[PDB]
Every structure is written in structure tokens, then in C-alpha cells.
Amino acid sequence: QSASNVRATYHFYNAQQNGWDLRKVSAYCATWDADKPYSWRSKYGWTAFCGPVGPHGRAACGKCLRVTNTKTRAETTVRIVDQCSNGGLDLDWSVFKKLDTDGSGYLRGHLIVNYQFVNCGN
């Protein structure tokens, strides 16, 4: 699935500083995904998802998204580890910073993105 004109905020999961441990960050998906291997947990930066198109909640856990900053065309790939209540994405700060290549996101408190579900790979 895909959507455009989506709000992406940030949240300090601080995934890398938590050893990519989903329990430590209180991620919704920890219930099912916390004991996945380190290689899985750490492959991609983390997001919460609650977008207008595609699965959210339990059915979305572990799935991956290509996320594009529409204004700047910056892109990255994230793994869904949490559910949000803001109608978009709530990216780990490190991810948001990487995408916020004109700085306007930090100033405003959100980015506007497009996303597409993608295969996560191994």
C-alpha cells in the first residue's frame, strides 16, 4: 500500500541506544516481535504507523516502509514497530533527522511524506 501527503512526527525511541530492544522502548509490536533476532530488529530505523492506507496495529507489526520527504525528496526505509494515534507516522528522531534535509521538519514539528510498503528483505 501507499499514500501521500502524510504527517510524520518524531518520537525519541532512541532505538540504537536501547540496543534495538522493542521492550525497552515500549513499542506496541514488542508483544510479538521483541524476540526476533538482533539482525532483524536493527536492520532499519524504527517508526510507529497509523497511516490512511494499509494495515496498522498488530497486522502491520514488522512490516517495512519506504518513506520520502515530499518537499526535499530525501528517502529512507523504516520498520514498523509501534502504532500511533496521529494519522501518519511517528518516526524515531534519528530517522526524522535523516529525512529532514532542509530543516523545516524540526522547526514545524512534522514532515509531510509519502510512503510505500516494501519487502523487508533478510
Side-chain angles (χ1 to χ4, degrees), residues 2-122:
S2 67
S4 61
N5 202 60
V6 178
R7 282 176 84 257
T9 53
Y10 65 82
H11 178 86
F12 287 97
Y13 293 102
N14 306 138
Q16 180 188 36
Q17 293 83 6
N18 285 283
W20 303 92
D21 181 329
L22 283 79
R23 300 183 172 96
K24 288 182 180 177
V25 311
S26 296
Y28 179 78
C29 300
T31 303
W32 311 282
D33 294 339
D35 296 314
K36 297 257 189 309
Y38 180 86
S39 64
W40 182 101
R41 292 181 284 114
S42 67
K43 185 174 187 180
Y44 295 119
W46 290 357
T47 199
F49 182 70
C50 50
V53 182
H56 62 266
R58 179 176 189 189
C61 285
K63 295 188 180 142
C64 299
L65 302 170
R66 189 71 176 172
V67 181
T68 301
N69 182 329
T70 308
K71 189 183 187 203
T72 73
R73 299 187 67 79
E75 304 183 333
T76 198
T77 305
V78 295
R79 191 179 304 268
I80 300 170
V81 298
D82 196 18
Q83 46 145 224
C84 47
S85 63
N86 76 354
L89 281 67
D90 201 10
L91 298 168
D92 201 2
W93 164 250
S94 44
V95 180
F96 187 101
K97 186 183 189 291
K98 177 182 181 187
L99 280 173
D100 187 25
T101 55
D102 80 352
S104 63
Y106 175 84
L107 295 170
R108 176 65 175 76
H110 68 273
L111 298 171
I112 294 293
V113 302
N114 61 95
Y115 64 79
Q116 172 72 247
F117 281 78
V118 299
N119 195 76
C120 292
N122 303 330

